[PDB]
């Protein structure tokens, strides 16, 4: 289980979720940025799994 990178971009979670051969969530991790620029997190603990995707969210106000 190597690292695996991923680029948050300014003001924003990453939320990547793992899937299974079902198409099945596996489960989900998350990586906050609070920074303007972008910036590079690795994942170093996940699951066996098939593929993952990921999300972006913004850190402003509700
Ligand atoms: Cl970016
Ligand atoms: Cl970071
Ligand atoms: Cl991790």
Redesign the pocket.
């Known amino acids: 289980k190597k690292p695996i990178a991923f680029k948050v971009p300014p003001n924003s979670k990453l939320k990547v979720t793992f899937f299974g051969p079902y198409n099945e969530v596996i489960t989900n991790?998350s990586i906050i940025n609070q920074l303007s620029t972008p910036k590079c997190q690795?994942?170093?603990?996940?699951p066996n799994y098939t593929k993952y995707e990921t999300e972006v969210r913004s850190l402003s106000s509700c």
């Open positions: 991790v690795t994942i170093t603990r996940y």
